[PDB]
Design a protein. Structure first.
Ligand code: PEB
Ligand code: PEB
Ligand code: PEB
Ligand code: PEB
Ligand code: PEB
Ligand code: PEB
Ligand code: PEB
Ligand code: PEB
Ligand code: PEB
Ligand code: PVN
Ligand code: PUB
Ligand code: PUB
Ligand code: PUB
Ligand code: PUB
Lengths: 164, 59, 177, 309, 164, 146, 177, 164
């Protein structure tokens, strides 16, 4: 998983040296930014269920045709898989938000996503509709103070730019 | 047979764009040859080659 | 806060038209069904602590884990607030039986109660049970089929109005679940 | 969240249930309207007050929290469930401080005037809440007299007719509000305070005059519940509503942009591939553009004469 | 919205008690005066166009300076706004006439009515001229029964005494 | 007890069929621009004719449902699997469900005379039960098209 | 609540330095532009119900769906609150024209209004339209180019201050959108 | 381009040998199947334009939402690109149909299609709607006798299974 610690340790391991002061300054920065990111993670684990509700409801508020035919949303059960995959992605945003690099969100969510989504006729545009809805529902000065919100924006940005 | 009895689609209530009309052949000379057989005008359109069979038997 | 009247007026306001004949005709059936509704509300009011006491004690007798230690009925003050809440539920159902429209009952209590009982830890299945007991008890009073009280009214059919009252109690029981 | 909201609402209902007696509303409290002018004006004054309450800065919300929490802990003695309600549900606690202060009738205006030095002392502590609002020469905007021109005139009228309402109370509930107001002013007396309690002793008006807290954080939590009432719109309707482009601004994926070509050069290979040609279809849309709206009032009557220019 | 039933339900709700026999008598009187109210509602829904036509025509018949410059209904559009406003008024007279309390006519038409007119420099006296024309004209027996007539005149009188 | 009142309702919905069918299908076309356009399911003259025929048939069997007063007549083999046929011919089902909804609303507004435009003269009554049977049948079928 | 004075003082406080020469020199250009700002605020104040009436009636004439039944201008009291809100918007814009800094306008009204109008269902596009109409109307009064009122002031160039007022109205219109 | 000739010559070139009788039998099979496939290609170049019309019109007959918002079909110009790309795919079906292997349809159409279609907001399901419409409009015993039709089905199968 790519984090600060794993990149500098892995890079020093490939170097063949002890960790010099550069890696030490890198983990110094990790323990600087840590509190802001972790406040974001605490609040995400706070109200994730309403994030499921508004996220998926906006996702079908944009595209109604998925509920129309047999294609991707034929039953209520496939809609339960819809909300389910959204909660997977939010849980990976919580994970990469705790780690601080995009490691677990890359190796768990993004890796090989395109063969699966292309295979099972799953459109990415509805995911992107959901995530853009979540970044449009960012209550910064009242809910996620400043920089917690900023880190959440960055992670969810990486999600969309991975998918699109 | 397919005939609706009590039935009017208004085609003025539609949005301004979405009335599209298409003509199979936009010409005078080719809609009617000098002889009677036609593939557009009259009862003569009944006697085109093809279309003798039917694909609604799949139900 | 909307009765039958305000329902017709609000719907005719959304249509922006005048009130006319057929809507008023259905409301004439309401006015002709007036005294039945009056005597019905009188029957449900004159059996209040009756229905609340039998209903909630029946709720405890159905599931005795409420009176078990650690339960939500397990304290004296908790039983007090329990009886009081059942009483207030019956009160707004009585207001909805006067009104003929459940808008008052939607605005008083039905909005914000489920999240409240989640916040307090009140079991919603047990409240739906108690509302169901008040439903069958109250309809048994409204048909005058109570096996402990048989009061004098002249004969008439009131199955539709009974189905209306059952619609209010099923609105509450569906609201808490 | 909304839990706090409903708890606050029902505590205000059991608050205002007192003084409504057994059906006769006891116009000693519950009229609130005066004339018809101030009847319509009190609604705008309340909405004024609420919006200026959420205009309060973020620092004042939390001083408001520890004051209302302190007060609600004094409100219930022992009563672990109640202190648990005061810690767990904040806007309930605000509605119980204010609601207790209503159901007692402890407030100053409800007091009539029989002596002068009572209202001199009342005027002094009045000036103390005035100083605690307005900090520096800059007026606080908790004051909120005017929202438009002429509203605070009706606030004058409502305040003075509100003074006239104090006199036609039964003397029973007047002596109630005296002793009861004393008791309250010693509940929240901030310690034991011989001088505060004795200046309360000779002056029950002064026992009325303690403003414990404010309503910043309870308004902060609720936000617009008071205006909206019951019309929380669902996400599905709010996306498809009037504010679609503003509720969810970032919704669009690849906005199409039309480039500014010169009409002289067509620039390349394009096929209309449409049922109707663009020239013909643009013509049709421009002809069908906007129907003259016929009006019923101008509709032909029986007979008629054509007007002449 | 004010009516008999909303006042008594709000009253016993204010007491926090079940509705006693007094509220039952009140709604009993509601279902006594009901048939006269709805008779007036049926006739108003019958001939509203002629009533609004005579109202506006008499309104500009009394005051000609409304069609003067630029002070008032000088153009065709503004006079169209005149006739549609009167219609809203008769529509609200029909609404409160069905309700039987002046609730919906108050909260829809009367509330904020004074402020809007002054801002738009709309004279209230000409409205009074229209309604008092429709008030003076009606015949209690010919068109309808006297009781319904009384109810109708009472509602219209409320409009006048709420206007200026 | 119903008799002339239930027969009266059925005669109200039946002698309003042309307006009801062409109403709902024209409102269905208006709701979404694509059906009318070339290559649409309802672009050719014949397909529009079968569309109006299907509207007339739905409303006709719903009317037959009312006289018997039982839903059993309304079901059976032709109606069943209708969804199998509309899948096997590429017919859109959300579009049909919208048209059935519009037919429902126009039917109840005709059955209560609240529809401004037709004021056929009947002595007044309560008919809410029967209205709920009418809306009951239209959402039986409206659940079966989807 | 910060004027241009408080803006310079707060920024010099964050720098923790004294005020110096150049910042005070730009503020000397403010003081020399004082009477122009005074006459400007006098012009916008002496045309209040003018700008509100024409602006909001123009807003309804642009999009007539507001007066349509079911719209947000469709009630008499809704129109009252509409006119009043436009008046209060113009009031805080006038305060920002006195101040020279938009901190007062950020603190009074710009905080909490978008969320509010989303909660009520007020169309934000229509409010941005009305603020734009008040922008062009107010700048037409501030250049004294009103085609029905031409009052006497001595000639001077005030395009910069007009661009400042247009910056306040664009701050409000960008705030609601 | 993968064909019979290129596979057997390339395979014999990898072998390092003269082309023995196996490759000779392979090109014998090519000149056996040649006539049936080339009949298919002649008829494709016959009525390709109506294939564009019915193909794209069915493509928006299924999915209407593309014409709704800014997303992929905002203007008539993007629809011109829609019909355009469909004619590219049909021209590649004509090319691979002439070659007889899937060579030019693979290296010209399929290769790198996924980064482009994913990068742009385009759903492959609309293409697949178009091609499934073309295989549903297969007039075998009247238009493309038997095996010409079969080869057309095989190539268009390969198109869908490449995209999906
Ligand atoms: C660890 C992270 C993680 C994810 C993010 C998901 C992603 C994911 N979703 C599906 C599978 C699915 N995902 C959806 C979801 C959708 N329904 C729609 O209408 C929308 C387009 C969309 C919701 C927005 C559906 C419907 C399926 C089942 C598809 C099918 O079987 O046709 C599958 C295949 C396995 C399965 O069937 O469950 C996977 C891997 N799974 C994971 O393990
Ligand atoms: C002010 C208060 C007030 C009341 C409480 C009622 C009470 C009341 N009810 C009826 C009259 C009636 N009340 C009922 C009601 C009943 N139908 C049944 O199946 C149940 C036993 C019962 C409802 C629970 C019926 C059916 C009649 C008509 C009886 C008849 O005509 O046979 C009458 C006689 C006048 C009439 O016919 O309306 C009166 C005074 N009226 C009032 O003015
Ligand atoms: C005109 C008459 C007049 C009075 C009699 C006082 C009464 C009074 N005291 C306080 C306020 C106060 N009064 C006291 C006094 C006490 N400290 C204790 O330990 C004892 C219990 C008690 C002294 C015997 C304290 C401590 C405060 C501040 C309380 C606090 O902020 O916590 C306040 C609120 C405003 C403020 O903070 O000053 C007022 C109105 N003020 C007046 O205008
Ligand atoms: C909904 C309520 C409602 C009403 C109350 C009436 C009111 C009313 N009356 C008339 C019209 C009329 N009303 C009368 C009545 C009168 N004859 C007299 O000798 C007496 C002074 C008076 C009866 C007491 C007459 C005579 C006319 C016709 C006047 C004329 O044409 O000269 C008209 C004009 C349209 C018409 O000609 O019918 C209207 C709107 N109409 C309504 O829709
Ligand atoms: C052969 C054809 C044939 C019909 C079409 C019916 C027509 C019909 N309807 C009623 C009579 C009636 N019809 C209705 C119907 C209703 N009233 C309402 O206000 C609702 C709008 C509507 C709901 C369906 C009512 C309420 C009555 C009077 C009550 C009743 O007779 O049961 C009567 C009784 C006699 C009369 O009124 O003169 C007759 C013959 N009967 C027939 O034999
Ligand atoms: C107490 C109230 C009060 C006011 C309302 C102002 C009015 C005022 N304005 C100016 C003076 C002036 N006012 C303006 C204003 C402008 N000229 C233009 O052409 C523009 C239309 C407009 C932009 C705002 C100008 C340009 C001057 C002259 C230049 C200057 O004095 O700076 C003067 C100088 C004395 C004089 O001219 O006789 C005064 C007193 N001052 C006050 O004390
Ligand atoms: C961890 C990530 C995380 C998010 C992304 C948010 C997302 C989020 N916001 C709200 C809820 C809300 N979010 C906002 C925010 C605002 N609405 C406006 O109109 C303003 C423009 C904007 C502030 C800039 C508001 C006002 C609400 C409450 C009402 C609403 O739904 O708009 C809710 C419902 C619960 C609640 O009321 O708090 C949720 C889940 N919450 C989180 O915990
Ligand atoms: C290059 C390859 C190539 C094809 C494979 C065809 C495919 C094709 N067929 C038709 C068109 C047609 N194809 C058929 C054929 C059918 N009749 C039925 O009973 C059966 C279901 C089916 C034969 C098995 C019919 C009947 C039409 C005319 C359809 C109509 O006009 O209604 C059209 C539209 C243009 C036209 O009218 O000719 C096209 C593109 N055309 C081509 O250019
Ligand atoms: C040699 C083969 C070959 C192809 C097959 C195409 C494939 C292709 N299409 C586009 C590009 C495009 N293709 C389409 C087509 C679509 N419009 C929609 O509504 C449908 C989903 C779809 C038709 C079915 C559109 C709209 C664009 C432009 C996309 C955009 O700019 O947003 C592009 C990017 C370059 C461009 O803008 O033209 C490419 C490479 N090009 C080739 O060279
Ligand atoms: C009682 C004296 C007092 C008052 C009146 C007070 C604050 C305060 N509450 C006020 C209002 C106020 N507070 C109440 C409280 C109330 N409502 C109830 O049902 C019960 C049982 C109440 C209190 C006992 C009412 C009815 C009003 C009148 C409505 C209105 O006029 O807005 C006012 C009047 C002007 C204003 O709104 O500011 C003031 C100044 N603080 C006080 O001590
Ligand atoms: C041992 C723990 C225990 C109880 C406590 C009761 C509680 C109880 N009352 C019922 C139902 C019930 N209760 C009453 C009210 C009641 N009857 C009257 O005649 C008078 C005057 C009453 C108030 C004094 C009525 C009228 C009914 C409806 C049945 C009936 O006709 O009696 C039902 C049936 C619920 C249902 O139908 O789903 C239950 C469970 N049962 C228990 O097992
Ligand atoms: C008897 C019923 C009654 C009232 C209640 C008042 C309400 C009131 N306050 C006003 C206006 C008003 N109110 C205040 C705020 C207030 N003053 C302060 O110095 C501090 C600290 C305040 C909050 C504690 C100010 C600052 C003004 C402006 C006038 C002034 O300079 O004081 C005005 C004038 C409105 C106008 O100009 O149109 C009124 C009517 N008047 C009444 O008749
Ligand atoms: C702009 C695109 C457009 C349309 C086209 C209409 C189509 C339409 N008609 C309706 C409903 C509707 N339509 C009619 C029939 C119709 N009315 C009559 O009085 C006569 C004589 C008719 C045939 C000529 C009736 C009777 C109703 C029921 C409502 C009513 O009482 O009028 C409804 C309401 C559907 C519902 O309730 O769910 C719609 C959407 N609406 C649109 O937005
Ligand atoms: C039919 C629905 C309708 C309206 C209502 C108006 C509203 C309106 N007033 C404008 C603009 C406008 N309005 C006024 C104010 C106004 N003019 C005066 O001379 C006096 C005394 C006034 C108050 C009584 C001025 C001064 C302007 C600037 C244009 C001008 O020089 O007149 C503009 C132009 C906006 C812009 O420039 O972007 C509009 C749209 N327009 C409509 O279509």
């Amino acid at each position: 998983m790519k984090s600060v610690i794993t990149t500098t340790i892995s890079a020093a391991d490939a170097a063949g040296r002890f960790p010099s002061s550069s890696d030490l300054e890198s983990i110094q920065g990790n323990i600087q930014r840590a509190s802001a990111r972790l406040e974001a993670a605490e609040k995400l684990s706070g109200n994730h269920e309403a994030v499921v509700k508004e996220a998926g409801d906006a996702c079908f508020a944009k595209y109604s045709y998925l509920k129309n035919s047999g294609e991707a949303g034929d039953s209520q059960e496939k809609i339960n898989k819809c909300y389910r995959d959204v909660d997977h992605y939010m849980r990976l945003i919580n994970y990469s938000l705790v780690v601080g690099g995009t490691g677990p969100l890359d190796e768990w969510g993004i890796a090989g996503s395109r063969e699966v989504y292309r295979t099972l006729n799953l459109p990415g545009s509805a995911y992107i509709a959901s995530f853009t809805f979540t970044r449009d529902r960012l209550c910064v000065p009242r809910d996620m103070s400043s920089q917690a919100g900023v880190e959440f924006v960055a992670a969810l940005d990486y999600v969309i730019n991975s998918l699109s | 047979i397919a005939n609706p009895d009590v039935s009017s689609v208004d085609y003025q209530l539609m949005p301004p764009g979405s009335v599209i009309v298409q003509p199979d052949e936009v010409s005078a000379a080719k809609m009617l040859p000098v002889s009677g057989m036609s593939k557009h005008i009259g009862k003569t359109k009944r006697l085109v080659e093809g279309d003798g069979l039917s694909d609604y038997s799949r139900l | 806060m909307l009765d039958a009247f305000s329902r017709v007026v609000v719907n005719s306001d959304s249509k922006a038209a005048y009130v006319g004949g057929s809507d008023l005709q259905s409301l004439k059936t309401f006015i002709s069904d007036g005294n039945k509704r009056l005597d019905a509300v009188n029957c449900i009011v004159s059996n209040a602590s009756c229905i609340v006491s039998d209903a909630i004690s029946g709720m405890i007798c159905e599931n005795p884990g409420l009176i078990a230690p650690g339960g939500n009925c397990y304290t004296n003050r908790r039983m007090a607030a329990c009886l009081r809440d059942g009483e207030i539920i019956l009160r707004y159902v009585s207001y909805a039986l006067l009104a003929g429209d459940s808008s008052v009952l939607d605005d008083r209590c039905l909005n914000g109660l489920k999240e409240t009982y989640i916040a307090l830890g009140v079991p919603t299945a047990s409240t739906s049970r108690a509302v169901s007991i008040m439903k069958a008890a109250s309809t048994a009073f409204i048909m005058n089929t109570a096996s402990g009280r048989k009061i004098e009214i002249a004969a008439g059919d009131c199955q539709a109005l009974q189905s209306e009252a059952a619609a209010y109690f099923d609105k509450v029981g569906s609201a808490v679940d | 969240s909304a839990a706090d909201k409903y708890m606050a609402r029902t505590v205000t209902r059991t608050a205002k249930s007192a003084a409504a007696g057994f059906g006769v509303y006891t116009p000693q409290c519950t009229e609130a309207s005066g004339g018809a002018n101030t009847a319509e004006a009190t609604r705008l004054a309340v909405l004024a007050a609420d919006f200026r309450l959420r205009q309060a800065p973020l620092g004042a919300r939390f001083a408001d929290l520890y004051e209302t929490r302190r007060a609600a802990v004094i409100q219930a003695c022992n009563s672990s469930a109640e202190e648990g309600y005061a810690t767990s549900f904040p806007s309930r606690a605000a509605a119980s401080v204010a609601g207790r202060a209503e159901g007692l009738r402890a407030c100053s205006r409800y007091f009539p005037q029989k002596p002068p030095v009572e209202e001199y002392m009342a005027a002094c502590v009045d000036r103390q809440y005035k100083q605690m609002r307005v900090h520096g020469g800059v007026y606080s905007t908790l004051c909120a007299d005017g929202r438009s021109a002429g509203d605070a005139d009706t606030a004058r009228i409502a305040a003075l007719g509100a003074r006239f309402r104090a006199q036609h109370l039964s003397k029973s509930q007047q002596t109630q509000m005296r002793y009861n107001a004393m008791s309250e002013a010693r509940m929240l007396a901030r310690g034991l305070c011989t001088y505060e309690e004795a200046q309360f002793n000779a002056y029950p008006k002064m026992a009325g005059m303690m403003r414990y807290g404010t309503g910043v954080y309870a308004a902060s939590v609720r936000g617009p519940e008071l205006v909206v009432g019951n019309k929380s719109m669902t996400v599905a309707e709010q996306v498809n509503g009037v504010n679609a482009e503003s509720y969810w601004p970032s919704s669009k994926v690849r906005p199409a942009v039309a480039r500014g070509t010169s009409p002289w050069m067509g620039l390349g290979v394009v096929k209309s591939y449409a049922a109707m040609s663009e020239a013909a279809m643009a013509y049709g849309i421009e002809q069908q553009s906007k129907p003259y709206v016929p009006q019923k009032y101008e509709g032909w009557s029986s007979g008629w004469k054509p007007k002449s220019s």
